[PDB]
Amino acid sequence: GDDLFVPVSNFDPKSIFPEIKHPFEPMYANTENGKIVPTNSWISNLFYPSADNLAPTTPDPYTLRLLDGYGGNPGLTIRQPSAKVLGSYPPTNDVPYTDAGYMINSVVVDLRLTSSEWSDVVPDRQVTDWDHLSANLRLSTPQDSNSYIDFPIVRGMAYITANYNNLTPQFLSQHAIISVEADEKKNTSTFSGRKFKITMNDDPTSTFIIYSLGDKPLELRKQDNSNLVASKPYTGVIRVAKLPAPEFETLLDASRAVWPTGGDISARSDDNNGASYTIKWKTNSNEAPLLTYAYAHHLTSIDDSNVKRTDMTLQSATKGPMTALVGNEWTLRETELSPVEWLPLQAAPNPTTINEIMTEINKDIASNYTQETAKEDNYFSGKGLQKFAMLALILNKSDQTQLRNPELAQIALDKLKAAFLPYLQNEQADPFRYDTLYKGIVAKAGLPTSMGGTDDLSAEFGHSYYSDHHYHQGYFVVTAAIIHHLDPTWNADRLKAWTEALIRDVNNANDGDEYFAAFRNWDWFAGHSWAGGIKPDGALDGRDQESVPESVNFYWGAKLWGLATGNTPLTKLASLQLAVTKRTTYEYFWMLDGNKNRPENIVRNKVIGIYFEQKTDYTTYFGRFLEYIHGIQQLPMTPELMEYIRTPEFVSQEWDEKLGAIAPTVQSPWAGVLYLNYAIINPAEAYPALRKVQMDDGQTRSYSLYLTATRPHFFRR
Ligand SMILES: OC[C@H]1O[C@@H](O[C@@H]2[C@@H](O)[C@H](O[C@@H]3[C@@H](O)[C@H](O[C@@H]4[C@@H](O)[C@H](O[C@@H]5[C@@H](O)[C@H](O[C@@H]6[C@@H](O)[C@H](O)O[C@H](CO)[C@H]6O)O[C@H](CO)[C@H]5O)O[C@H](CO)[C@H]4O)O[C@H](CO)[C@H]3O)O[C@H](CO)[C@H]2O)[C@H](O)[C@@H](O)[C@@H]1O
Ligand SMILES: OC[C@H]1O[C@@H](O[C@@H]2[C@@H](O)[C@H](O[C@@H]3[C@@H](O)[C@H](O[C@@H]4[C@@H](O)[C@H](O[C@@H]5[C@@H](O)[C@H](O)O[C@H](CO)[C@H]5O)O[C@H](CO)[C@H]4O)O[C@H](CO)[C@H]3O)O[C@H](CO)[C@H]2O)[C@H](O)[C@@H](O)[C@@H]1O
Numbered sequence: 048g049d050d051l052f053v054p055v056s057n058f059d060p061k062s063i064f065p066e067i068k069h070p071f072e073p074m075y076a077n078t079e080n081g082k083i084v085p086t087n088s089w090i091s092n093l094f095y096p097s098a099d100n101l102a103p104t105t106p107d108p109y110t111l112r113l114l115d116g117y118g119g120n121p122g123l124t125i126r127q128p129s130a131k132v133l134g135s136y137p138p139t140n141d142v143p144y145t146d147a148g149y150m151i152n153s154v155v156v157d158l159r160l161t162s163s164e165w166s167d168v169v170p171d172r173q174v175t176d177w178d179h180l181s182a183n184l185r186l187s188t189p190q191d192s193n194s195y196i197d198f199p200i201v202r203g204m205a206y207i208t209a210n211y212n213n214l215t216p217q218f219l220s221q222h223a224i225i226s227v228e229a230d231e232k233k234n235t236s237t238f239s240g241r242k243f244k245i246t247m248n249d250d251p252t253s254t255f256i257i258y259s260l261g262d263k264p265l266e267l268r269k270q271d272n273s274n275l276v277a278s279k280p281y282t283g284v285i286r287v288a289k290l291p292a293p294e295f296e297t298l299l300d301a302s303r304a305v306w307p308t309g310g311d312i313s314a315r316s317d318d319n320n321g322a323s324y325t326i327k328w329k330t331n332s333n334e335a336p337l338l339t340y341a342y343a344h345h346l347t348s349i350d351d352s353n354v355k356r357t358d359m360t361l362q363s364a365t366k367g368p369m370t371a372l373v374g375n376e377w378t379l380r381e382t383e384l385s386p387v388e389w390l391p392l393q394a395a396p397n398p399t400t401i402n403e404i405m406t407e408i409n410k411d412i413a414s415n416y417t418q419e420t421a422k423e424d425n426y427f428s429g430k431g432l433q434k435f436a437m438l439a440l441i442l443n444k445s446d447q448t449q450l451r452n453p454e455l456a457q458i459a460l461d462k463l464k465a466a467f468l469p470y471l472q473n474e475q476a477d478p479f480r481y482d483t484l485y486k487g488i489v490a491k492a493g494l495p496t497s498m499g500g501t502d503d504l505s506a507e508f509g510h511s512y513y514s515d516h517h518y519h520q521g522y523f524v525v526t527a528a529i530i531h532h533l534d535p536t537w538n539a540d541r542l543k544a545w546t547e548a549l550i551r552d553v554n555n556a557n558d559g560d561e562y563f564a565a566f567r568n569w570d571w572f573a574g575h576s577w578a579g580g581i582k583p584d585g586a587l588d589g590r591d592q593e594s595v596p597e598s599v600n601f602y603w604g605a606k607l608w609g610l611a612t613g614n615t616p617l618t619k620l621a622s623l624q625l626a627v628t629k630r631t632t633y634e635y636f637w638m639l640d641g642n643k644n645r646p647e648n649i650v651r652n653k654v655i656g657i658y659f660e661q662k663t664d665y666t667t668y669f670g671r672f673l674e675y676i677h678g679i680q681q682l683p684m685t686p687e688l689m690e691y692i693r694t695p696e697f698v699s700q701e702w703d704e705k706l707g708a709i710a711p712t713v714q715s716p717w718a719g720v721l722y723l724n725y726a727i728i729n730p731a732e733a734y735p736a737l738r739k740v741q742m743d744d745g746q747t748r749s750y751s752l753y754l755t756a757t758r759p760h761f762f763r764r
């Protein structure tokens with residue numbers, strides 16, 4: 048096969064963007080290991096203090112919290128969410144057909160790992176090392192560096208692993224320990240051995256198994272109804288697992304000896320129109336096969352020839368049941384990559400619609416580009432730029448689309464250039480700066496006043512704190528790929544450097560690139576992108592993601608850039624990321640009927656809303672209205688979104704259950720978003736509607752007619 052984890056470029060972004068150091072630094076990071084602190088990772092909370100020390104880090108199926116002060120002894124808190132809490136909102140006609148508005152997990156101390164040495168002292172925390180799949184966390188006694196616990200925190204771990212060094216183990220819970228079986232022997236208050244089956248008084252019953260892997264055994268006294276203290280400082284590894292069911296005690300016994308410490312990810316493409324990525328787990332020893340929990344989308348795409356599936360399942364924070372897999376290597380295949388490039392698969396519109404489309408195109412090209420592309424911020428500017436990039440696109444590929452008008456094609460391309468040029472020269476309202484701390488490019492607007500910013504970290508949607516980089520930069524990349532494809536000589540060198548700095552800021556696939564962090568927004572274990580960046584005072588529900596199509600839009604743009612420059616590894620990686628996105632979207636975000644990964648109340652909502660690591664919220668960041676919530680999952684409508692990502696089956700289910708009732712009532716621009724989505728299953732009804740209703744600010748009527756008129760099953764109504 049051919050390798051996808053290669054650098055895009057090694058251009059030094061300092062030649063284009065003024066350099067800064069991010070004002071908000073990582074408090075708990077080993078500054079002396081040469082690694083880059085990730086801005087949008089599941090490990091990101093670990094690097095900063097949080098309010099009440101309640102910022103969760105979720106390797107899944109365990110959720111962890113550091114140093115939260117309930118239960119007295121600070122340490123590492125574990126929660127394992129067997130059950131979820133549904134909450135609802137006060138009913139309004141803004142959202143008519145809903146009963147479950149949000150799903151959350153209870154912040155409860157299922158079990159804490161600490162020390163009796165830390166009764167009157169608060170331990171110093173540090174992130175000693177990290178990669179994409181893991182982080183090692185050390186809690187040590189202040190001013191006594193040789194007394195510490197190391198926690199290798201790794202995606203999917205079946206146990207919590209704690210390397211104690213010169214400290215006295217203590218295990219507290221918020222529940223009561225009703226029973227304790229040492230070394231499988233059954234009445235006492237002091238216990239001895241290397242295995243401890245403890246059971247709690249919660250609902251449902253949580254059962255934990257504790258393993259002592261060090262040279263000496265452990266001696267635990269039941270101090271409270273909630274605490275097990277050891278006899279003396281212990282040196283060695285202690286592991287704790289939740290027993291999902293009684294018939295898996297032997298499985299946990301067999302795998303107690305081997306722990307993950309990290310993982311290396313690689314990716315290949317093949318000439319069978321496919322691609323794959325592989326996770327090679329880093330372990331401590333190889334004396335036993337590795338046990339690891341996998342997400343629903345892992346089970347359906349893994350190559351089964353080097354792993355054994357088990358029946359052991361625990362609930363994840365928000366992605367449904369995870370299933371343990373046995374093995375040290377995972378190869379995940381996507382055999383069906385997207386065929387989409389610049390246009391719909393049928394590039395030519397129904398012949399009865401050409402005069403109508405050409406009339407609308409002519410109107411849309413006559414628009415005032417300055418007022419529709421020089422918006423207050425980069426985001427809305429990008430929507431305008433891409434929407435006009437589409438019009439120049441279809442007009443200058445008239446040999447395929449049949450929208451012939453050489454004069455209009457050239458004006459479309461000129462006006463697009465004029466409007467895009469200020470962004471290429473970094474002379475827009477909100478110019479970018481290159482950040483040496485976190486190795487990315489950030490908008491200037493959210494920076495403090497001393498760097499030319501507005502002091503508001505929420506300016507530009509949090510882009511200065513690395514939020515929504517793929518939403519924003521997706522539009523500019525699509526635009527530039529279209530300009531560079533239609534006219535490869537226009538500002539070629541600055542264009543190639545500028546566009547690739549953007550692709551690299553979001554999607555650098557290789558540490559060999561010294562200037563950009565690796566995979567800022569993509570997460571290879573979760574199989575989708577994250578939007579939430581640096582969240583001062585903690586991201587108390589972990590990373591978040593709202594828009595899927597806007598993430599799709601960056602990976603489509605990356606792919607188009609790959610087509611416009613002849614870069615096969617870039618084109619192939621973008622495809623693979625689009626294929627994983629599609630699979631995971633239908634596992635977790637856009638729920639068909641019978642979805643196994645959510646409570647039925649949530650499934651009837653059809654979209655998850657805003658998705659976080661620790662909760663899901665049927666709402667938006669800009670208004671709790673049904674057409675906003677479903678509409679945001681429907682723009683920008685591109686050939687990628689129309690031909691590949693949004694499937695007839697889902698569009699159809701969603702339309703019969705939610706949108707059919709509301710799209711025709713809608714009297715805002717969201718009417719155009721909805722009826723363009725509808726053109727996917729019913730172009731015959733959509734086309735007349737798209738002639739009348741209002742357009743989204745990133746949508747044009749002409750392009751929308753064009754995408755509808757190119758559906759294969761289109762007919763005059
Ligand atoms: O009231 C008058 C006022 O109203 C405006 O109009 C509305 C219009 O702006 C709205 O536009 C939509 C736009 O918001 C939507 O955006 C998403 C964007 O949400 C997503 O962003 C999120 C961030 O929003 C978010 O930060 C959180 C913050 O929102 C929350 O409120 O508080 C927290 C602070 O304590 C903070 O954490 O963070 C995440 C990352 O973690 C971001 O991803 O990403 C993209 C862009 O970034 C985008 O998809 O986009 C829609 C386009 O699809 C826009 O429609 O639309 C409404 C439609 O009716 C309007 O009401 C007016 O325009 C103004 O003139 C007025 O001031
Ligand atoms: O329309 C007029 C005005 O509407 C506002 O739009 C609303 C929009 O702001 C709102 O979105 C919801 C978010 O506010 C909510 O975000 C929550 C965070 O705010 C909360 O943070 C903190 C935590 O960081 C801090 O440390 O402590 C606080 C107390 O413990 C805690 O509150 O973070 C939460 C996760 O950690 C997060 O939930 O998130 C919701 C998603 O669950 C959003 O729905 O949504 C409204 C309805 O959709 C919007 O109307 C505009 O912003 C205004 O400018 C408008 O004028």
Ligand SMILES: OC[C@H]1O[C@@H](O[C@@H]2[C@@H](O)[C@H](O[C@@H]3[C@@H](O)[C@H](O[C@@H]4[C@@H](O)[C@H](O)O[C@H](CO)[C@H]4O)O[C@H](CO)[C@H]3O)O[C@H](CO)[C@H]2O)[C@H](O)[C@@H](O)[C@@H]1O
Binds near residue numbers: 662
């Ligand atoms: O009509 C909008 C008007 O009201 C404002 O909107 C509300 C919004 O505030 C609300 O968000 C809450 C989150 O705050 C909440 O988060 C939890 C924290 O509150 C707590 O401190 O910690 C836990 C961690 O365990 C957090 O999860 O989560 C609930 C449920 O997820 C949210 O509902 O959500 C409403 C729905 O969108 C929203 O309408 C807005 O700020 C006003 O300006 C506006 O006028």
